[PDB]
Every structure is written in C-alpha cells, then in structure tokens.
Ligand binder design. Structure first.
Ligand code: SPH
Ligand code: SPH
Lengths: 48, 96, 243, 284, 243, 284, 48
C-alpha cells in the first residue's frame, strides 16, 4: 500500500495530475527450485 | 533487472496507461494511492515482469524482492509518500 | 552531501532531500541507565527492535489563521504498537526519542514553522482568579495523538514568551530553505526511572511564526505530518495493565 | 558460532575561562568562496561570526571579570520567602515551607527546571510596632508525617527528636543551614504530570502540576510561656541558596503572577514584552 | 536433596517439597535459533524477562468420574500478559516451555494422573462416515485457557491408544508419592520460525488413569492447577494486531 | 563500567553398536542399602534394572544381529500407494500424489511425526484381464501450479519443461527416483493447525490438519495415440522410501482407519487393544 | 533514468540478522533449463 505522507503541493500554472511508474526486480539472495511448465500459453492447432 | 509493474490493471485503462499510477493534490490527509500483493506467480501486477514470468517456469521461490518507484511529474511539484510493506496475518490495512 | 539524509531505525527508514541538519538536544545521545544511577532491584526488559522504530502520527492541515499545536511525549505512544503495550504492563519507564516533522511546499509558497522541544511543559489556566481558579482538563494537558491547538501561542499557554523559546532545542521549517526538522532528545528527568502514564517528560511544539501565504491558483492544502521514534527504551516493574 | 547479532560520546567541551575573551587584529578580505557573514538560522544553531571577520579590529588584551555571573554568585543572596503572622490572645502559628509565594526570588528560580542546593535560613522576628521586647520564642521544624502542634502548650513542643531553636526577640536573628532534603535527585519546579493514578477530571483537576518531591514540611512557632501574653508578632524568613547546581534552562516569566503552585495567567490582559512606540521606522 | 526444589524464572518462582524429578523433553534445552538454520532476514526481538515467567492458569476440579483434559501451547498464552501482545503484533514465533502441574492430596487419598506432552496433537472427529464427515469445532481444537475435557481418553481422542502414550515426555502424579510434575520442552517443528496463531506446536494432557478415591469425611474438592512458562522466546515480522 | 547485566549441553550420547549386548557373570548379594529392584515410575524414566542384578547369570558372548531393525532397512521395502484407473473410450486419468490412502504403508509412516526421505516409484500397468498388449503410454508429472491436461490430445502433453516417461505395456515397469521436494525441512504427517488466517467455524472446518507442505502435485497418464483405442487400464504405483531420517516417535494406530487426510474414528465402536479372555486370574 | 537498476541491499534499509544461506542456485542455469526434451514435430504417414 502507498499512502500520502503530506500532500502533492504545486505552484500555479503547473499541472496538478502527475504519474508514478513502478518497477520490480529481485535481490541478491533470490532462488527458484523446481522447473515446471508455465500456464501463460494455450494452443489448439499445429500452427500451419 | 528492473521491469515495469502494471499496478493500474483495472477494466478502464486499456493500453499503455496500465503501467502508471496517478497522483494529485488531495483534499483530505491520510489517503491511499495504490496497493498490490507481493507474489511473483500470482495474477496481478507482477505478471508483466521478468521476475513474474520466470517464477512461473519454476516452483518454490525464495529470497527478498525490491520495488522501485519513479516519479514522472514536473520539476516544481513537491510532496512526500509513505510506502509500507505489511507481513501476512491480516487483510489490507485500512488507514495509515 | 548535507541536504540529503536517511534515518534507519528498527524496520523503518526516512529519506529526505531538502533537509537542514540534525540537532542533538543538549549535546548528548540517549543511552541505557548505568548501574551507578539505578535505584530499582529488578531486571529491566529491552525489546530494542519492536519498540525502537518510526511511528507516524496523523497530519495537521496548516491554514492562514492557525495559532499552532502541542503533543506530550510519551503520551502519544501509550496506545500504539508494542511500545503502547510495554508502557502499560510495566510501572517504570526510560527512553530517548528521535523526532521528525515533515512539511513540504512549492517554490511559490512562503512561511515558517518553529519546531521546538520543551522539557516539563506545564499548561497554564486562563483566568484572572486569585482563589476558585481554572485548571486545564485532562484532554488539554495530556492530549494524545490528536494534539491540541494553542489558544495564545505568543505566551506558549504558560505565561512564558515565545521570543525566548529558542533556548530549547529547536529547528525552523522555512519553506524556501528546508522541509523537515529533526531533533534527537535524551532522557531528561530528576529520577532515573519514572512512570510513563502519569508523567510526560517533554512536549513537541510546532508554531507557525510567519504565516502561510500563497498566490491564487496554488495548492491550498498544506499538511504537517509528524514521525517520532523511541531510542534506547527500557521498562521495569511488571504487573497487570493500567492505561 | 552461536547467534551472531546478540554480540552486537558528546559534542561540548568545557574550558576553564578566567577573564573575558581578547581580540586579535584583522585585515581586509578580497577573495571569493570564504564567507563568514552568511548564516543559516534553520539549523538550530546560533551565528558563529566573530568580529575579527566582519571588520578590521585591533589587539585588545581584555582584563574584565567573568566571576560575578556564575550561578553560585547569582543565587547566594538571601531574599524573603515567607511571613508568619502570630497573634497571641490560638497562641501559635504554622507555615508550610513553600518559597513560591514571594516574587523576587521566584522569578530567579524559574529560569531553570532542576535545581540542587543547600539553604541557609534566617528568621527576623519583630512586633507590629517595630520590635525589641524581651520575650522568648520557639521555632520547630515539623517534617512530613510528624504531628503538628495543636495547642499553645501541647505535648508536641517537647521536641525530643526533630530540630528546634530557642531565641529571644532582643537577640540577633537565628540562622541555620538546611541540606538537600528531597527524595529525588533535584528539586524540579515544573512537573508536567499527575501524582496519582486514576480517572482525571475535565472541569477542575487541582492535582495537575503538584510535585510531592518538593513538599518539605511545616514550620511552627510559639511564645515559650504558660499564661498567654498579649502581643502581635511577625517573623520574616530569608533563604540563601548555597552550593547550588542548576539544569535545563528555560525562558524567564513575562506575564504577571497569580497563584503559588500553579503558573496561571489571564488571557484577557496579556502584557506585551516590549513597550510600544510610534512606528517601526524610528528609534526613539 | 531431591524431593525439594525451587524454579525461579523471570520475576516468579515455584517451590515444592514433595517433588519427583525434572524431565527434559528428548534430552535437549530450549535455545535461540542459530544463524545456520534461520531463514528470515530481519532482526528478531528478545524481551527475555517480560515474556519468560510463570503464568498460572485456572484450576480444574478433579472428581470421581473425570474422563481427563488438554490444552494447546502456545494457544493459552496468546491473550495473557506481554507474551500475548508480542504473539499478536509479530508474524513469526519461536520458544520453549517449562510446565508444572500442581495437585496435592492428603495421606488418606489415592489416585494417579498422567501428565504428558504430545507434539503435534491432532484432534479427531467421532463419526462413522467415509465421505460428509464430522470435524471438530475451533473451540475443541484450539480451546484456550479453559482447556477441553476428553470424550474418549482411552484413545486420546485421536484413534491412538493411551497405553503406548508413555513414549512422549511424561511424568506421573501418584498421590502417595508426589504432588507435582515438571516437563521442560524445546522447540519441535519442521520450520525454524512459525506462526503462533495458526499453529500450536504441542499439547499438555492430564488424564487420571486410576480414579480418585477417598473415605468418608475427607476433603472432597481436589483441584488441579497448571503453571507454565516460556523459555528463550523470540518473535519476528512486526505488523498490526491479529488475534 | 557500562550497565553490567547486558553482558550476561545435553544428556544422551550415541554409541556405534554392532551386535546385541553380552551378559557378565553374577553372584549373590547379602547386604543392605544397595537395591536394584526398587524403581520409581513417577520420575518419567524407565527401569534400569539389568538381569545381572536380579539373578545369577553366566557369561554369554552374544553374536546376534541388530542390523535389520534400523529405520533404513525397515522402510526400504516398496509397497502400494495408489491405483490409477484409465478407461479409454475422456481418454486420460490423473492422480493427486497422496500416499495416505492405502493402509499397509500408512501405519508404518504414522509411527513418527517428521520424516525426510527420497523415494523410488515404480508403475506396474496392466489391462483388466491381466495385461500385456503392445500399446504405448505417457506418464507426466505435474507440479503444483503447472497446467493439468484437459484433453486426450491437448497441448499440455508436449512436455517441454516437466518430466515424463514413455513406456509400452509389454516392457518392464518404469522406475524413477524422486528427491525431497517439500518447502519445509521435513514431511510432517500430523499438522495441528490451520493453513490460513481468519474466523474458523464450529460446524465443519474442512481445513483443520491440512498441511500444504506435503501436497506435491498431480500424476497424469494417457495412451500415446490419435484415434481413441478401446481398452481399460490400471496402473499401480509402488513407493520405496530410501535415504530416510525420522524424528519424534509416537504411538502406533490401534483403531480402524476412515478418511485419507483426517484421522477420524467412530466412537460408538471402539475396538479394544487386547482381545478378551475369561478372567484375570488365568493365563490361557 | 541512468539506465541502471537499484543497488539498495536489505542491510541498508532495515536491521537484519546473520543468515548463513545454503540454498541451491544450480537448477536455474541455462543448461539445466533447456536440457528437457519436448515435442517439436509430428509426422503423419498414411500407407495406401
Ligand atoms: C528550626 C529550623 C526550621 C526551618 C528549617 C526549614 C527546613 C526545610 C527547608 C527545605 C528546603 C527548602 C524547601 C523546598 C524549596 C521549595 O520551597 C519547594 N521546592 C517548593 O517547590
Ligand atoms: C514420471 C514420474 C511421475 C512420478 C513422480 C512423483 C514425484 C512426486 C513425489 C513427491 C514425494 C512423495 C509425495 C509426498 C508424500 C506424501 O504422500 C505426502 N507427504 C502426503 O502427506
């Protein structure tokens, strides 16, 4: 959860709607054990 | 390698708008901006990363993670944000 | 290399990019009670992670006609977290603190706050009686997390002028220079251990000296958040809960 | 080999200073990057610009005294703390020892929060028309818990354990020394707290600020006689703070005083610290 | 020099004058988690006085037709004391225990209790269904401070006979020999840290094997009190309160 | 110089034992004070009276073997754990890998709480009339989270990442080795707890005792063909526990079994552990 | 914006303990990830 600490304070003649791009990765002690197939894929033919 | 989360995965965005989190000037204090689970391998924002797509080829991950927020407003806009991780045992926190 | 700082205490951390400096109150660091100054004969508890961390209070909106605010320490943390549970089961108490008041504003805003730390800050009553006499209520002396607004900030509600109140440990939040004030306070009391429920040691005070002014079109809502943290806290005299 | 993380100074520096500081000669500065006039008051520190770096000064060997300004020479001056009225014909008079009732010595003591001192009392007893009548007096000191006297010739005046002083009116005034008698480690003049537990009220809590580490007892006085002599008296008690140590300075009072134990003021008449003038752009 | 003992832990102490001996469960002492077996990357809290002390539960009256009793640990201490507040704010948990069951009776009374410690004691349901099926309620599996009486003590309510239940750490309270049983138990779990709210490690069980008999005129009310104490307890993963 | 109180073993001993214990010769005891026959069972310890101190024994060099009684030689005997029924004409069959369904190998594994082992599976596949028909089979292993196959010729049988075994019916039976695949440090057979947080019900909580550290996946099987052949099959899966370590022994089951995952019994028919006899005063 | 990822380790954010980590980073290499045979083609032969 992201919370407003104080506010988004802005001077006049400046847009009052800004954005945040959020990123993600893993640290230096990250591992993975058992290899399996992924569920992100479907297929119903042979791709002629 | 840091890749972008889709935190704004609602049914309204429909495009490249899905990658970014809106902020604005609030009338009340204490307010919430966004929220997402911490689960590489679950439906949600982590699914559009290299971590969340390689942890689907593998079972049983382990280790720490990191989330980097970049602010794309103007130069004159100022502010402060609180970014809080809460371990399991309960539901999403209701206030700051 | 001086405007940028990070303060990691416990499992929490505060960043800042527009700071001024960090003030030690009276040149000393909070430490544990030595054996040559202790008077109890039991062993104290020292949790050291679960109670030494940054607790964030609520936010105070700063307006045109604000006359200012005050909290009591450790009154505001007797009901939050595991510090609020160790300060109820235990009769005795000793700690330091590390305070941080955040208030940001743009390049077109102006004003200044006075963030000071007053040891043994006693609230006065407001009557012209020579004995009956008016005395402040319990929610005025010991306000809690919601603080209390001053009635007369010129005399600090204690018959003592603000113009000499820079003898206390303090900083300024000048909106053209910084956005945060940090004061680190040791344990200041005449006894080594004292109760955390009857006796609040000092009081944080944020008073806007020069008022908030902004031209038309700017952001009208300027909040003031306060994030505090105990340091080197230890308790004694285990019993049942008294709030 | 076991769990590892179970295994895991100050700023100020006092100098013995005898006289006031000297002044070394200066010259003119024509260079960039080095500026002693620009400060930042937001850091909570005072300005450190000395006068050798603002102007061009001369060499002054300063021989002024910084002796009378210490906290021992400032408080070792005895002032009035209490007046005990005795009208004989209940025959005696008591006085709860509280020096916060007279305002010359109170405001000097409200500069600081914690003070640790010895005292030296003096009792100047006169009649109402000036004094000097050869009658004999007795001054008891009643500690907290001891029975206060309940009569002119009661049995508490036998005084087998607690101190007492016999002196006539026509002698020089009696004078004793009193040690640090508090159970804490310092007298605190401002106690932000309540003495007892419980539900504290909202309307009128007369216990807020009461510090029981300061209540030191009762001072009783009678005329050592059997038949009631008929003469009105006043004693005046003068306390001299000696061997004094002080901690945690605080600002000095600027509002007019109201009650002994409570720091009350009226909000409808707040006196300004600086007396007014015509405008800001003229000095007189 | 063997029937007399005193057990001082924290600010509490238990004397006894008619004891038998003290049993270490599986020959090992409760200790802290070493660095070669830890899997979390935060620093744990170790209060060490405020949570390591003898907590006395309520008393169970022992009658002619008692079929026996069971508690879950650390279920009974999640709501008592500062151990009950550290086990709610923290996700992770690790401790040992030190148990003591007092039951005195005169020289004209007879009977025997079986005080054992069963790691991972799973309650069974009591139906002849092969799938729906009966399952025990939450106040039967996790009873709390009031315990729960057995329905079928001959099979320990788990389809497993009492006659072989001396393989667990145990003592006897034979009313002609002793009056108290003491069992010291280390941390027995497949993971180094685990939650103190979902998972109760073991269960103390007091079952009267030979019944209480007394001649007429003797004292009819024989209670059984249980005094337990955590040892080398440490917590981790600070968050808000979940009971 | 700082605060001082911030500054502030086992019992058993394993011996490599090859054969059974010997017996040393004894004599007769005629003395007071030294008694090996009197014990105290209330101390939680077993009796330590050896047979040299009860009777008069001889010298016996004992050469019996204590090798077959260890926990490796006791569990390295493969037994049936699951039977997968495949009727072709949905075309496939799955089996959630849970060995708590057959009772010969379950009761051996319920002696202990925590076990850490490797396995060695064997799949004996026959027809319903005895077997031996030359058709080709495929056995996939589906880990938790992987997509289970949803058809006879679906795309999950491409098997590019997870293991699979091709073997005919007329070959010798397929046999693999399987490592310790749990996320914890031991398989626990008794988990006194709940998997998730929340308000747990009173009537029927089907989650009590569910240990998710033991759920290891799904075993799928089909006939590698395009047109649906029409022949009914059964596989039989035999698990051999090898490299096995065991902790925390517990008593053996004495009541008849009911459900796979839950240790239920009926209370109206409790079978006695010892079968009855006529009276207590006769042995036969 | 510098094109680099964050280098903040978890010892510099919170207070951590000493953990001797013994997890395996062997099955995640590109040899153990691709040495698993999968289907690449189906050849249909009808004779007559
Ligand atoms: C015959 C001798 C009688 C007089 C002896 C008087 C001794 C008692 C003096 C105690 C020390 C001063 C009293 C305390 C000072 C201030 O009034 C209190 N702290 C009030 O806050
Ligand atoms: C082509 C090979 C397919 C067969 C491979 C099977 C591998 C999965 C076996 C995992 C280890 C045994 C499963 C766990 C044992 C017990 O059934 C569970 N603990 C149940 O409580």
């Amino acid at each position: 959860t992201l919370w407003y600490q104080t506010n988004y304070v802005v001077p006049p003649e400046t847009p009052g709607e800004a954005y945040i791009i959020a990123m993600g990765a893993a640290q230096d002690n990250f591992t993975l054990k058992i290899c399996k197939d992924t569920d992100e894929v479907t297929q119903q033919a042979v791709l002629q | 390698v840091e890749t972008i989360l889709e935190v704004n995965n609602t049914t309204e965005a429909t495009g490249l708008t899905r990658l970014l989190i809106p902020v604005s000037s609030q009338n009340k204090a204490d307010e919430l901006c966004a929220a997402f689970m911490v689960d590489p391998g679950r439906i949600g924002p982590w699914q559009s990363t290299l971590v969340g797509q390689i942890c689907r080829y593998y079972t049983q991950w382990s280790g720490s993670l990191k989330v980097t927020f970049m602010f794309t407003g103007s130069f004159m806009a100022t502010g402060k944000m609180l970014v809080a991780y809460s371990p399991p045992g309960s539901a999403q926190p209701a206030n700051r | 290399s001086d405007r940028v700082a990070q303060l990691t205490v416990g499992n929490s951390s505060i960043t800042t990019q527009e700071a001024a400096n960090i003030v030690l109150a009276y040149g000393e660091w909070p430490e544990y009670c030595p054996d040559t100054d202790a008077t109890a004969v039991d062993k104290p508890t020292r949790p050291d992670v679960s109670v030494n961390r940054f607790y964030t209070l609520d936010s105070k909106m700063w307006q045109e006609n604000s006359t200012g605010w005050y909290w009591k320490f450790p009154d505001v943390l007797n009901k939050t977290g595991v510090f609020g549970q160790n300060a109820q089961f235990h009769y005795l108490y000793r700690s330091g603190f590390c305070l941080h008041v955040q208030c940001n504003a743009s390049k077109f805003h102006q004003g200044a706050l006075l963030v000071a730390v007053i040891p043994e800050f006693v609230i006065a009553g407001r009557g012209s009686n020579t004995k009956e006499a008016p005395h402040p209520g319990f929610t005025t002396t010991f306000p809690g997390t919601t603080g209390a607004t001053f009635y007369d900030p010129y005399v600090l509600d204690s018959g003592v002028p603000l113009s000499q109140a820079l003898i206390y440990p303090h900083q300024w939040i000048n909106l053209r220079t910084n956005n945060c004030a940090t004061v680190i306070v040791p344990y200041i009391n005449a006894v080594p251990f004292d109760s955390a429920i009857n006796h609040s040691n000092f009081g944080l005070i944020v008073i806007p000296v020069s008022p908030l002014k902004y031209s038309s079109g700017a952001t009208t809502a300027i909040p003031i958040t306060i994030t505090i943290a105990p340091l080197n806290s230890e308790f004694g005299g285990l019993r049942q809960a008294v709030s | 080999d076991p769990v590892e993380d179970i295994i895991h100074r100050a700023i100020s520096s006092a100098t013995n200073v005898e006289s006031a500081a000297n002044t070394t000669p200066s010259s003119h500065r024509l260079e960039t990057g080095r500026v002693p006039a620009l400060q930042a008051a937001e850091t909570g520190a005072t300005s450190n610009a000395t006068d050798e770096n603002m102007i061009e000064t001369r060499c002054v060997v300063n021989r002024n005294g910084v002796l009378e300004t210490t906290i021992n020479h400032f408080f070792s001056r005895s002032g009035l703390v209490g007046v005990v009225n005795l009208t004989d014909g209940t025959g005696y008079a008591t006085w709860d020892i509280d020096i916060m009732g007279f305002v010359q010595l109170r405001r000097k003591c409200e500069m600081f929060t914690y003070m640790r001192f010895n005292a030296e009392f003096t009792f100047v007893t006169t009649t109402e028309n000036g004094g000097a009548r050869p009658y004999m007096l007795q001054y008891m000191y009643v500690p907290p818990g001891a029975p206060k006297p309940t009569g002119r010739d009661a049995f508490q005046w036998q005084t087998a354990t607690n101190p007492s002083v016999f002196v006539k009116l026509t002698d020089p005034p009696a004078q004793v020394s009193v040690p640090f008698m508090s159970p804490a480690s310092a007298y605190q003049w401002f106690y932000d707290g309540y003495p007892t537990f419980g539900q504290h009220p909202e309307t009128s809590n007369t216990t807020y600020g009461l510090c029981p580490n300061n209540m030191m007892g009762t001072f009783a006085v009678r005329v050592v006689s059997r038949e009631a002599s008929q003469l009105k008296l006043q004693t005046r008690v003068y306390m001299k703070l000696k061997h004094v140590r002080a901690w945690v300075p605080r600002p000095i009072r600027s509002q007019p005083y109201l009650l002994k134990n409570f720091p009350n003021y009226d909000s409808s008449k707040i006196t300004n610290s600086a007396r007014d003038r015509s405008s800001i752009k003229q000095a007189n």
